[PDB]
Design a binder for this molecule. Sequence first.
Ligand SMILES: CCCCCCCCCCCCCCCCCC(=O)OC[C@H](COP(=O)([O-])OCC(O)COP(=O)([O-])OC[C@@H](COC(=O)CCCCCCCCCCCCCCCCC)OC(=O)CCCCCCCCCCCCCCCCC)OC(=O)CCCCCCCCCCCCCCCCC
Ligand SMILES: CCCCCCCCCCCCCCCCCC(=O)OC[C@H](COP(=O)([O-])OCC[N+](C)(C)C)OC(=O)CCCCCCCCCCCCCCCCC
Ligand SMILES: CCCCCCCC/C=C/CCCCCCCC(=O)OC[C@H](COP(=O)(O)OCCN)OC(=O)CCCCCCC/C=C/CCCCCCCC
Ligand SMILES: CCCCCCCC/C=C/CCCCCCCC(=O)OC[C@H](COP(=O)(O)OCCN)OC(=O)CCCCCCC/C=C/CCCCCCCC
Ligand code: HEM
Ligand code: HEM
Ligand SMILES: O=C1C(=C2CCC(c3ccc(Cl)cc3)CC2)C(O)=C(O)c2ccccc21
Ligand SMILES: O=C1C(O)=C([C@H]2CC[C@H](c3ccc(Cl)cc3)CC2)C(=O)c2ccccc21
Ligand code: FES
Lengths: 378, 56, 164, 45, 81, 104
Amino acid sequence: TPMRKSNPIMKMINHSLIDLPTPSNISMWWNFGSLLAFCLILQIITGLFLAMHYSPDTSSAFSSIAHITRDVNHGWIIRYLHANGASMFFICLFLHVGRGLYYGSFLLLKTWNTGIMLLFLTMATAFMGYVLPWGQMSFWGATVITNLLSAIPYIGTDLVQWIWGGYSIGNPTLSRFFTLHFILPFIITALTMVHLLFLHETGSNNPCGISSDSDKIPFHPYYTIKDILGLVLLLFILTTLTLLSPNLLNDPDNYIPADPLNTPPHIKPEWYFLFAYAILRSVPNKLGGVLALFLSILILSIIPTLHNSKQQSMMFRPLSQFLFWFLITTLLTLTWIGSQPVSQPFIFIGQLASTMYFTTVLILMPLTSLIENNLLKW
Amino acid sequence: AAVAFTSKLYSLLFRRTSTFALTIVVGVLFFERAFDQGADAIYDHINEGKLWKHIK
Amino acid sequence: KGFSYLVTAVTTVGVAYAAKNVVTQFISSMSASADVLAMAKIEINLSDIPEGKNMAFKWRGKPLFVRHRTQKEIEQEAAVELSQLRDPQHDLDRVKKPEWVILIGVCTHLGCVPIANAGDFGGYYCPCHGSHYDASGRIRLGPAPLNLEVPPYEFTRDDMVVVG
Amino acid sequence: MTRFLGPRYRQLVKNWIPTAYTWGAVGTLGLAWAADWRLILDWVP
Amino acid sequence: GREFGNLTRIRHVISYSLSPLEQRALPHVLSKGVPNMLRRVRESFFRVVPQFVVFYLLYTWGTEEFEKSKRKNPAAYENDK
Amino acid sequence: SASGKWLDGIRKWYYNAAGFNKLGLLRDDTMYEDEDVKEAIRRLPDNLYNDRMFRIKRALDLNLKHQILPKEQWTKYEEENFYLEPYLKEVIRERKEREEWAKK
Ligand SMILES: CCCCCCCCCCCCCCCCCC(=O)OC[C@H](COP(=O)([O-])OCC(O)COP(=O)([O-])OC[C@@H](COC(=O)CCCCCCCCCCCCCCCCC)OC(=O)CCCCCCCCCCCCCCCCC)OC(=O)CCCCCCCCCCCCCCCCC
Ligand SMILES: CCCCCCCCCCCCCCCCCC(=O)OC[C@H](COP(=O)([O-])OCC[N+](C)(C)C)OC(=O)CCCCCCCCCCCCCCCCC
Ligand SMILES: CCCCCCCC/C=C/CCCCCCCC(=O)OC[C@H](COP(=O)(O)OCCN)OC(=O)CCCCCCC/C=C/CCCCCCCC
Ligand SMILES: CCCCCCCC/C=C/CCCCCCCC(=O)OC[C@H](COP(=O)(O)OCCN)OC(=O)CCCCCCC/C=C/CCCCCCCC
Ligand code: HEM
Ligand code: HEM
Ligand SMILES: O=C1C(=C2CCC(c3ccc(Cl)cc3)CC2)C(O)=C(O)c2ccccc21
Ligand SMILES: O=C1C(O)=C([C@H]2CC[C@H](c3ccc(Cl)cc3)CC2)C(=O)c2ccccc21
Ligand code: FES
């Protein structure tokens, strides 16, 4: 035998990414998982460096970041890279989800469920990093997200006070944010390995939705060079964002330190969250609002159950495709509404967008699938 | 023949796993309180006169 | 069989006791420490607060509003129909002197600080998710479930009030 | 599903009801004992 | 498990290939690739584009309306005094 | 009555919109292989099995090459063969019978 197959560690590597049988015909939409992994690695490295200069204390956090960006050699670009890498991470994440919704890869149940877990974990992590600078937006974001558990009817307020460690947001809460933000990424790493373990038991779905076991090619050299090309492209975009236009996504209100006595007139979270914010804004009831907020993501878990089609992929299903793109526009609409004041036109538009989101996932797609079946005479 | 204590104990309580578990939770509820009280009594008694509870 | 199973039972009971104690003390590590729990009172001098002015003071880590209401506000807050409220309450259930009102400046929805003299009702407006309050601190529009909270106080001088 | 409507399934569920409510008792009392839940524990002599 | 020795059962299929060093990497772009991209755009245009057009109309409308709402109404002062 | 011609009209429209005919594929080729479908595929005679396998490989190759067949070679709506339906119906009957035994 070759050494490639002489040994358990080596043979696992070989079954993973040398002699793995991959479909010949998968497209660019399948590159975004490797880019996700790359992004995780980038974040961990840049974070370990930042960590050695940051101060988890409310009387010096802000100024520690000032110190990083002004006195540490090239510290400014390390900061820039961390912040922009998070944004890239979520871009890839959203595109990665959407692929699977379009091409019917949710029928790999274990992979799909571990994906949902990973989405949740990544969001938690990103939010707990966003409050560390202790600027004016960070503070009130913390406040809202930790008051969320007050909606639990019997035990909520006590949960809030047990997470605060006191009567209010304060120094004891910031160290908790920092410990959790430190530890979560590694749990994410382990669960990613489990995710891929589950994947390699079946292999990759493909655009046509039919079995590809007659035309499998090896992962090396084809997809090795293909993914390397994808990585080169991602690095070009990331560099241009870091050096040529660093302030594109930046928010001025987080360059004012925290003031516990004043909330600013215009409130806006980080962009990858706006849509949830809009959903949360759309229900005139506290408990109902929070419930909707969490269901908006948890609803992905029952898509496999509502599947009626005989065919797996939307490639050959046009009515389906039309609905898919309408759903994507509803999400764009929620993102846009999240940016606007809480005033009447936007209130009404947001409520319609929310009802149409759930409607579409839960009702319209199942019924169009049945119509489609009937048109093909089965 | 001889209805003996451990046999009744097996047949009523321990034969079925759910009931075994229930027996265990019920026993711990009462053991905890009895055991605490005994220990606190002994402790208090070893060093009477030196604890601020009574000096108060 | 009975005897052998009795031994296991007893062992399990002891293990449960030990586990409960360990886990609970670990959990009580994360509750408020013995240097965070101070509770002081606060004294406010009222002759520095003009008519129509809302002042905010820091108290027990959170804002405390003191509002010096004008006559038309005292009049129009009384007109309100209590049947059209989600947390019904009359103004005189909420003040000790009509021209002063004292509140805890925290929004009952998710904790943001209402801005004063804003919204549809002349009271306060919360930017975070859009709840409106009236000059009695009553919730009038938006997702919040309750009225703004009133602390215990008392007047020690016609120009001094103590909140505790 | 629609498959699990029929005689055998009714009989089979009846077979397991008692074990079910016994495990329910176990879980309830354990939760209460673990969280020193006074709402239930104040009634224990 | 899944391994190139026993994936499936096939009979009577013939394949032919050249080596990479025998052939060109970008053989015919403007005579074949461009028209192909054009038809590939044609086949999907009406399944994707109109939804986004509708989004654009909604966005512009809502912006205009919000901005009108902030301008003072003359009848609010002229009507009664 | 006319309603037949009308329904068949919309059905032909939907078939051309789907476009698996552009790749040289039959409808029964495009099913997802659940348990019953795999058992129906097991039951096929050799000629049908081999024809299916080659057709599918050919579609995959075309998809790899972002290309389609010449229009002259597209599958036409009026002369298609539902070769797998009969076997699938039998498989499903058998499973239904077993279920119905299981509830007594
Ligand atoms: C100061 C800052 C400077 C920044 C500089 C940035 C420079 C970036 C350079 C990037 C170069 C990339 C080169 C990649 C080579 C890869 C080769 C390869 O294998 O590709 C395969 C890959 C496709 O993969 P695949 O295997 O075919 O699978 C895909 C599908 O499954 C296939 O499915 P299908 O076949 O069905 O699909 C067919 C059709 C489907 O067609 C449709 O769906 C229909 C579309 C119709 C559109 C009609 C026009 C628009 C709508 C009008 C409608 C009417 C409106 C009416 C309004 C009325 C109002 C009243 O889709 C296509 O053919 C798409 C082709 C074009 C892709 C474009 C990619 C854009 C990338 C943008 C990056 C932006 C970020 C840059 C960084 C910025 C930093 C600040 O891509 C290609 O084949 C195309 C390669 C060439 C792409 C060039 C892109 C250049 C972008 C330049 C942007 C510059 C401006 C930046 C602005 C920034 C603002 C902040
Ligand atoms: C979320 C927080 C709150 C959770 C509270 C939990 C409530 C429920 C607690 C139940 C405890 C007793 C369960 C016994 C189950 C025995 C099953 C079994 O197989 O037994 C036979 C087995 C094997 O026995 P055997 O093999 O000799 O014979 C058994 C054969 N039969 C059944 C026929 C007799 O015995 C064991 O080895 C069981 C060991 C169990 C060890 C449990 C330790 C205690 C852990 C829970 C308590 C601590 C909670 C701390 C909460 C703190 C909150 C702040
Ligand atoms: C002092 C300044 C620095 C000097 C640095 C000098 C080294 C420069 C870099 C050299 C890289 C290595 C090139 C040669 C590798 C040879 C590997 C080899 O012979 O093993 C191949 C063969 C392949 O396996 P099979 O497939 O089973 O083969 C069957 C064939 N039918 O064996 C293997 O499995 C691979 C074994 C790899 C061994 C690698 C050894 C590396 C040694 C590095 C030393 C570096 C020293 C640095 C010193 C710095 C100053 C203190
Ligand atoms: C910094 C700000 C970032 C803002 C947010 C960025 C992410 C959102 C971006 C939205 C726009 C994405 C446009 C992508 C290009 C679309 C091109 C297109 O329409 O091509 C159609 C073409 C048709 O091909 P086939 O049907 O396979 O057949 C061809 C072979 N004969 O390709 C497709 O349809 C492939 C579609 C794959 C999925 C695309 C998903 C895009 C959006 C995903 C993210 C959306 C938000 C999250 C959704 C899920 C939420 C639970
Ligand atoms: C840190 C987050 C994640 C990482 C690092 C990750 C990584 C990967 C990688 C490397 C692949 C290989 C195939 C590919 O790239 O398409 C993959 C496939 C897949 N991922 Fe994840 N993923 C993440 C999150 C998610 C999420 C959020 C979902 C779904 C909600 C998901 C569902 C899937 C599915 C279904 C596949 C296989 C689909 C197919 O092969 O057709 N993953 N993932
Ligand atoms: C999925 C992985 C990660 C994500 C998504 C993430 C996200 C973020 C975000 C969004 C910020 C705030 C950016 C800003 O304020 O401009 C941040 C800050 C920070 N993160 Fe990360 N992070 C990750 C991994 C890590 C790791 C592993 C560490 C290890 C210590 C770390 C340490 C820090 C530190 C110290 C800060 C504060 C410094 C600063 O604000 O510039 N991060 N993180
Ligand atoms: O990119 C991968 C992939 C993997 C390649 C190696 C990556 C990776 C990431 C980080 C390190 Cl340090 C090493 C390898 C992880 C993703 C993997 O397992 C698949 O199964 C797959 C299938 C289709 C298309 C792409 C892929
Ligand atoms: O009012 C808010 C608010 O409502 C949120 C929200 C946004 C959505 C978040 C969210 C929670 C859970 C999930 Cl799964 C996704 C997003 C929770 C915090 C903020 O992020 C925020 C930031 C800064 C100032 C004010 C605010
Ligand atoms: S925090 Fe005030 S409306 Fe939500």
